[PDB]
Design a protein around this nucleic acid. Structure first.
Ligand code: DCP
Ligand code: CA
Ligand code: CA
Ligand code: CA
Length: 438
DNA sequence: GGGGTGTGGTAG
DNA sequence: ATCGCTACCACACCCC
């Protein structure tokens, strides 16, 4: 066991943290895209008419961890057992659950302790460990298969297990549902073969937003083709409000307050007005939802098609550590800040940039919150504080950056024993060119 | 019109 | 036990 004051803490935490893995895998996929396209264009233009195939592994970690499970789980049945992937036994996140588990109401992100209560007696939850390297290998097979099929003009990485794949249709060609279904079935079968048993679902449409909703309707282990010309009340009635991309729990709560608790996207689209929507959730998010309820993308979402190199380019670099943070004094806090800045500077030098602006953010135990929260080593209920600094000259120098980060910590006034989380951010990245003469 | 700050929220 | 990350738009509210 490795405590936060141990030099090996960051290495250990990132080795175990699935959320760190997701972030790192996504960042690597974006960098790979940029490196592979440095001399190519491969951007969608205004003259192109396109179809979106949104392809995503079903219950990704649960599927892979099952297929790669150790001999102690040899008898586990993926079709009949409720399966989760997690580290622990109580207040530990279910990173992924299979569709048997979801039949009982279990969802990704739930704690094991919450999920166990949803099972009737005699039904036992199977908890599989993470298989991080094999998650990545299955991802490799997925992205390799997509490219090998030679059916897409543009393949955009969304996640370790998910890609937006764009097919341009010439005016030349009469696209049909039958042709799209055959492509869906080819993709699904080739990925199933190429990954040695993992399944993907596919949403197929003429917008990014409808392709995402079609993907949800397709799952598990299926495909759905719903173009704007195919839209119906039956389609909209099939979705919850937070099935919309960009709508999470906070936005959902506002929509339910404003529109008398709609229970489907059909309820919402029959009740809303654009003006009332903007007043409830904000101008830009309101417009996004209004357009989505017509099956249409907003301008911000379309940028990934028309300028993927800009959208996928990294603009900031940070670490966040909000688990395991228990320091007794400022000396140990300062050493942790130094270790984090060393880690960040290794990443910054790998991309050959400097930074011009940095931020320290912290989580501090709320005055009335227990010192030991419900989740072992968790941050618990906290107040957040952050402060940024503009550096005089863009730099990659540890002495400058770590000294200023430690200064920023002091300005926020958090006693070491009350600290529950820390974020170190390089907010603005600056190119390094061949001319460095003053 | 231009700039700045810290914070909210989402995704996977 | 248990590994609650992290990029990035949008916002509110401040300056000239
Ligand atoms: N709260 C979450 C959500 C996702 N993930 C990890 C594990 C997921 O398997 C993987 C992909 O996320 P998805 O949202 O695509 O979810 P799944 O693939 O598990 O299920 P599905 O896509 O079938 O709904 O990211 C996680 O660790 N914690
Ligand atoms: Ca998935
Ligand atoms: Ca996914
Ligand atoms: Ca959503």
């Amino acid at each position: 066991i490795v405590a936060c004051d141990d030099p090996d803490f960051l290495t250990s935490y990132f080795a175990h943290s699935r959320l760190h893995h997701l972030s790192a895998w996504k960042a690597n996929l974006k960098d790979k895209f940029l490196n592979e396209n440095i001399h190519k264009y491969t951007k969608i233009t205004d003259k192109d008419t396109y179809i979106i195939f949104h392809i995503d592994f079903d219950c990704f970690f649960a599927t892979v961890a099952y297929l790669c499970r150790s001999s102690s789980f040899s008898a586990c049945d993926f079709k009949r057992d409720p399966i989760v992937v997690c580290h622990g036994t109580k207040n530990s996140d279910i990173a992924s659950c299979n569709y048997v588990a979801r039949s009982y109401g279990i969802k990704n992100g739930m704690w094991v302790s919450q999920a166990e209560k949803m099972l009737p007696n005699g039904i036992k939850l199977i908890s599989l460990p993470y298989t991080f390297e094999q998650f990545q290998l299955k991802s490799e097979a997925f992205y390799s298969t997509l490219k090998r099929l030679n059916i897409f003009n543009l393949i955009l990485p969304i996640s370790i297990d998910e890609a937006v794949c764009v097919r341009i249709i010439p005016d030349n060609i009469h696209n049909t549902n039958t042709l799209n279904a055959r492509l869906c079935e080819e993709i699904r079968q080739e990925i199933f073969q190429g990954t040695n048993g993992c399944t993907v679902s596919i949403g197929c449409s003429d917008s990014l937003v409808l392709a995402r909703l079609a993907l949800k309707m397709a799952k598990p282990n299926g495909y759905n083709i719903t173009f704007k010309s195919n839209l119906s009340e039956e389609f909209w009635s099939s979705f919850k409000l937070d099935d919309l991309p960009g709508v999470g729990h906070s936005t959902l709560s506002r929509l339910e307050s404003t529109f008398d608790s709609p229970h489907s996207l059909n309820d919402l689209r029959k009740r809303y007005t654009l003006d009332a929507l903007k007043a409830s959730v904000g101008s830009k998010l309101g417009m996004k939802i209004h357009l989505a309820l017509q099956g249409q993308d907003d301008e911000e979402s379309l940028k990934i098609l028309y300028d993927p190199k800009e959208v996928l380019q990294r603009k900031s670099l940070s670490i966040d550590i909000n688990w395991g943070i228990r320091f007794k004094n400022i000396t140990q806090v300062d050493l942790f800040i130094e270790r984090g800045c060393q880690y960040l500077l290794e990443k910054l030098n790998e991309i050959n940039k400097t930074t011009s602006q940095i931020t320290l953010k912290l989580m501090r135990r709320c005055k009335d919150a227990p010192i030991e929260p419900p989740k072992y080593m968790g941050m618990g209920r906290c107040d957040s504080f952050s402060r940024s600094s503009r550096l005089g000259i863009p730099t990659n120098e540890f002495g400058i950056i770590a000294t200023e980060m430690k200064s920023l910590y002091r300005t926020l006034g958090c006693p070491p024993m009350e600290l529950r989380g820390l974020a170190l951010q390089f907010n603005k990245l600056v190119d390094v060119g061949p001319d460095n003469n003053q």
